[model samples]
Target: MTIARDIVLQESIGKGRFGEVWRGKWRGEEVAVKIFSSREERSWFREAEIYQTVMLRHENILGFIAADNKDNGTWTQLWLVSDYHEHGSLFDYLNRYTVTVEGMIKLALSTASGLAHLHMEIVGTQGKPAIAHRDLKSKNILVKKNGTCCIADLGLAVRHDSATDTIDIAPNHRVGTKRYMAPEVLDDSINMKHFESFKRADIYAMGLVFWEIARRCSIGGIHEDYQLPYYDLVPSDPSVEEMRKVVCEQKLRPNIPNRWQSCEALRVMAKIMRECWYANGAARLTALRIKKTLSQLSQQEGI
Candidate 1:
């Protein structure tokens, strides 16, 4: 029994608040290695454990390839490996290129499919309860070379029945990204005991992501490269309160293309996106419903 340690670390692809991601070759296979920062050591282990424990095998979800550990005095270096997608994060794709209405719909279907899988309870070994990705966003979504998508980053996910049923919030931090945070997440005045409400927040974030892609497609046309719609609004540095106001109070809608006025597919997607963004989490459609609607749309479009 021999162990294969053919991972050759290459150039860095990206760096986030938590760690750096590098393009690597493992046993002649291309993979992305995420080396966690010192501050994120705990999160690294927790995420790896969750992935290993949960039998999550889906086409759209980023599959867990492997994990590695190296000792450091203060902070042990932990590496989580996953399949490499050359297209990179959805955020990067959105910023760099634009898509068409058809392209947007395709991307939406792929994304919704991924989220739907995570939201459902899968029967794994030992009959464990289902899991939920507490933190779902464009940044956590990776696009494949074939125009499909897969979800990445599971550091904040939790088991369905954990004692602390509530979504995990960092100290002095919130549960989700500012722009994508649901109304309840923004208003401290609301009851925090509503666990189901947090699930709806993920759905709402999915809708926002859909809206973002749609906006880009509408503005950039079908065949053109990616072009960002929110060039003015810097997502990375948005103020929490400002985001709360925008997501909670100011209902921002995507610009609808004049050509799509009669397009039922575009109209339905727009309606669904708006419905998900409802200020009241209870009013939002469940991930299941979203999946159903998207499925029907896919069938109708013959996509």
Candidate 2:
């Protein structure tokens, strides 16, 4: 495609199992280009298809610019272009800077808003299917310049068709991020036949992400270092059984500092985190419910 001609790739921003992401210039406008390895064509196509879904666009969802495949005689190169967030992922952002009460709420609220929209089904002639992010984690989330976050990496996402009561799972064998997997996911007890099961699993992972964000929020001039959930209990690359042992067997979750009680927003966040960690997936709060709860908390915090 002529897409390669107009866009000039600059420096590489990040790299993952998928491939490299680069800061590029598209029609004189900045963009982030995800160059998927040729072997991962299915993942590239699945993410592009999900992004093009009708009514899927939202302020908190990563803005999709375009997707193209270029054949260069030797092999094919798959490209996915999107809006670039200079702050990068929430994982990177929290490690670099601490947030204020309002800052933390904005990040958390926007994330919930993104997932709420993703999980909501819009019914009409041009309706949107309910989507579940099978891999929800801080790294898969981007921080916009406004301090709000957007959900990204929809390659492993699944869509629910209400009319047929069926799920359109992504055509890939990749698994969910092990570190973010919920008890149901780690123990392989998640119900695949039901769509809501996937959404609940997303909620469980979101709670872990919220914990990551909350720990970096400054309260009384005290903010802790950025640490992943169960950082202390598990290895950097924890195995499935290791996670299952800590999450399902021991039923241990990240510790919430006692000082959080002094801050109303942090207190409420801690409570919400507990609800999200319930062993029973059915008991976990829905994305919309968490969004509403965070909405009220934002208002109360004068955000």
Task: Please report, in order, the local distance difference test score of every candidate based on alpha carbons.
Answer: 0.70, 0.90
Off by over 4 Å in 1: 1-4, 37-39, 71-76, 123-128, 162-173, 189-191, 218-236, 251-259
Clash pairs (backbone) in predicted model 1: 96-226, 97-225, 97-226, 97-227, 98-225, 98-226, 98-227, 99-217
Model 1 TM-score (2 dp):
0.84
Tens digit of lDDT per residue, candidate 1, span 265-290? 77787888878877777898887788
Q: Flag clash pairs in model 2.
A: none
lDDT of 2 by residue, 207-238 (tens): 99999999999977898899999998999999
TM-score of each: 0.84, 0.96
